[PDB]
């Protein structure tokens, strides 16, 4: 966990007590084997932590009730209750998997309820022992002489089953549950719940169940995920709802929707497929928290997920990520060493960052309450860097084009390599994904390469487990200022996006040859000379790839062949990295490149001219 940060075993396995109330009223303090499925929120000043209180064993299909522990002193002190009771219909009756919403001084909890099944939910024969329960709680935060206090009265639970269609587009429905963890209140005031639906047969999938009348009605919105998507999380971004899904056996799928879920678009230019369940991505996946907060004047999203280096359900190394839907920063591990963590929750309150997440030892589970001093600190530092640079760049008077000129483009400006560097790392100005460097010597705002393999590699698939530049495969705009320093024996590489796989494939890219012509590479079509360039002279290159199409620009003008289809078929390309210069063959590209900019969209033509018109102004 960050140096400075700390934690406390808030819901301690086999130690902590919950007031279990017997059939006939008596209430007894009772030990609880494992506490799993945490969520901690902030109802009007009073901290609320909800969880599965699994009395006898950690297994899903045993006896479970929803416990809370709220507080009015930022964790100094804590009270404990049992928010929802199970039916008590057998020795496995349970309510679980709370998905929580907070509006005003009310808490709307949504849990799955089962009576006697001993197998898990997707494999049930019908939905007859399952019920979707809605429960509301109200925080009453009265005080007393320099000492606030508070109560939470919980209401009888209400079943949502009569409002669940038997059919979705002809998909027979079996059962549903909320996504797990915190959901939200829409900026339009709706109560929105991401929910996971199992059909008759075990296919699972995701949807938005919302309320525009504070709890009284619920509507199942038109759109859905792909099959294999479960435990969705949700937040609102620039008028849109963004739904991050858990995906067993594959990479995490992300969808955006602008109509409260009526239509879903897969977020291929931003967050989809970036995150995953294990280095090899074929393991069971794991719940995540995905929360919109404002830090240092700026709205970012916050995302938690373990690396699972150990695999299966160990869920070691919980991580924390922060993104503005453009850049993605890895804050670090919020958990200690090789401990096995699990489902987590993050909460920003009165300028303090916190977490409530699982720890697992021999499958007996605890919930730790963590204080993110370190992380927050680091988080502000980079939000400061994003604002700081966005604004700078957005404040450069670029030249007026014969019709101050249009702004330097910063929207979806993902990364940028300028002046800061050394012999083996060109650093990202937006502090997220640096460049790996070789045989280079510094020049203002960039590197002059010279030597076998001199160039730089901006990891794309080579990034590894988490793939933060996953976007390039859908669209990108790669920009750079260059000169050719020495003529090439034949043809050498200048700037590109090269393909994972055997051989030496490139998606789109540009090279120069012995004749002083440019050789743009458009997918697998063979390079063919075009134009003229003059050693030493400064050129503005921009490579552009969208709609499976590519274009290359020199001096704001597109070279011949631009627009050529660059990849065939439905699968997205798997870009390995972007190359600057000439990072098998002993490639010695003798060039100097400076100020490389990266965008998650296809900049436009006037946008490209803005950059061409202002490249001697963007540098750090
Ligand atoms: C209803 C239920 O089974 N809940 C469990 C869920 C589910 O089992 C699985 O995601 C696929 O059905 O999994 C997990 C889990 O740590 O993986 C915890 C949940 O409590
Ligand atoms: C519960 O754990 C606490 C934390 O250290 C400790 O004080 C105490 O020994 C434990 N009580 C039990 C049930 O043994
Ligand atoms: C309620 O149930 C418990 C369970 O053993 C019993 O001992 C308790 O005193 C009961 N209360 C009454 C008044 O029966
Ligand atoms: C489950 O059991 C309870 C307790 O008797 C019953 O009233 C409830 O309605 C049952 N319904 C389901 C979800 O099968
Ligand atoms: C080079 O600089 C980067 C950050 O600028 C740093 O991570 C690296 O360790 C430095 N030194 C080496 C060995 O390249
Ligand atoms: C180019 O895009 C910029 C910003 O996204 C915008 O100002 C301008 O209207 C666009 N021009 C075209 C060609 O649509």
UniProtKB/TrEMBL annotation:
GO cellular component terms attached to this protein's record: cytoplasm; membrane
GO biological process, one term: oligosaccharide catabolic process
Entry EC number(s): 3.2.1.18
Protein name: Sialidase
Disulfide bridge positions per record: 397-404
Alphabetical list of InterPro entries matching this protein: ConA-like_dom_sf, Sialidase, Sialidase_fam, Sialidase_sf, Sialidase_trypan, TS_C
Sugar-bearing residue positions: 15, 24, 115, 422, 604
Domain Trans-sialidase C-terminal: 409-605
Keywords annotated in UniProt: Glycosidase, Hydrolase, Repeat, Signal
Pfam families referenced in this protein's UniProt entry, alphabetically: BNR_3 (PF13859), TS_C (PF22925)
Sialidase domain ranges (all copies): 37-358
Molecular function per GO: exo-alpha-sialidase activity
């Amino acid at each position: 966990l960050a140096p400075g940060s700390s934690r406390v075993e808030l819901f301690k396995r086999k130690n902590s007590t919950v007031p279990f109330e017997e059939s006939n009223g008596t209430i007894r303090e009772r030990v609880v084997h494992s506490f799993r499925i945490p969520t901690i929120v902030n109802v009007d000043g009073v901290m609320v932590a909800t969880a599965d209180a699994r009395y006898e064993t950690s297994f899903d299909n045993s006896f479970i009730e929803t416990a809370v522990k709220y507080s009015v002193d930022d964790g100094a002190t804590w009270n404990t209750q049992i928010a929802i009771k199970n039916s008590r219909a057998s020795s496995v009756s349970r309510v679980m998997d709370a998905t929580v919403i907070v509006k005003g001084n009310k808490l709307y909890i949504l849990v799955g309820s089962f009576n006697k099944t001993r197998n898990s939910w997707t494999q049930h024969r019908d939905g007859s022992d399952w019920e979707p329960l809605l429960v509301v709680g109200e925080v009453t935060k009265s005080a007393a002489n320099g000492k606030t206090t508070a109560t939470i009265s919980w209401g009888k639970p209400v079943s949502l089953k009569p409002l669940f269609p038997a059919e979705f587009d002809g998909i027979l429905t079996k059962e549903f549950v909320g996504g797990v963890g915190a959901a939200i209140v829409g900026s339009n005031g709706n109560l929105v719940y991401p929910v996971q639906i199992a059909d008759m047969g075990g296919r699972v999938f995701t949807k938005i169940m919302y309320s525009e009348d504070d709890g009284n009605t619920w509507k199942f919105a038109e759109g859905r995920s792909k099959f294999g998507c479960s435990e969705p999380a949700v937040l609102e971004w620039e008028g849109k709802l963004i739904i991050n899904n858990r995906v067993d056996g594959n990479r995490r799928l992300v969808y955006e929707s602008s109509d409260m879920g009526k239509t879903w678009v897969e977020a291929l230019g931003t967050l989809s497929h970036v995150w995953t369940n294990s280095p090899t991505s074929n393991q069971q996946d794991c719940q995540s928290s995905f929360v919109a907060v404002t830090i240092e004047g700026k709205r970012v999203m916050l995302f938690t997920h373990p690396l699972n280096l150990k695999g299966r359900w160990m869920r070691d190394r919980l991580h924390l990520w922060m993104t503005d839907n453009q850049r993605i920063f890895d804050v670090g591990q919020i958990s200690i060493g090789d401990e096995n963590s699990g489902y987590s929750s993050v909460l920003y309150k009165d300028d303090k960052l916190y977490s409530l997440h699982e720890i697992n030892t021999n499958d007996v589970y605890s919930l730790v309450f963590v204080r993110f001093i370190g992380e927050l600190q680091l988080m502000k530092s980079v939000v400061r860097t994003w604002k700081e640079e966005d604004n700078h760049l957005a404040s450069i008077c670029t030249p007026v084009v014969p019709a101050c000129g249009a702004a330097v483009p910063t929207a979806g400006l993902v990364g940028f390599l300028s002046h800061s560097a050394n012999g083996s790392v060109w650093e990202d100005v937006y502090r997220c994904v640096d460049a790996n460097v070789a045989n280079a010597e510094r020049v203002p705002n960039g590197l002059k390469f010279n030597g076998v393999g001199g160039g730089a590699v901006w990891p794309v698939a080579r990034q590894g487990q988490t793939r933060r530049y996953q976007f390039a495969n859908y669209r990108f705009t790669l920009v750079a200022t260059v000169t050719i320093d020495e003529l090439p024996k034949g043809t050498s590489p200048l700037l590109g996006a090269g393909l994972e796989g055997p051989g030496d494939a490139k998606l789109l890219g540009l090279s120069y040859d012995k004749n002083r012509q440019w050789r743009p590479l458009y997918g697998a079509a063979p390079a063919s000379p075009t134009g003229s360039w003059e050693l030493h002279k400064k050129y503005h290159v921009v490579l552009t790839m969208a709609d499976r199409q590519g274009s290359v620009y020199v001096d704001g003008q597109p070279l011949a062949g631009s627009g050529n289809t660059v990849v065939r078929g439905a699968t997205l390309p798997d870009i390995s990295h972007f190359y600057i210069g000439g990072p098998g063959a002993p490639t010695d590209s003798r060039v100097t490149v400076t100020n490389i900019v990266l965008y998650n969209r296809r900049l436009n033509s006037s946008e490209i001219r803005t950059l061409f018109l202002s490249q001697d102004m963007i540098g750090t």
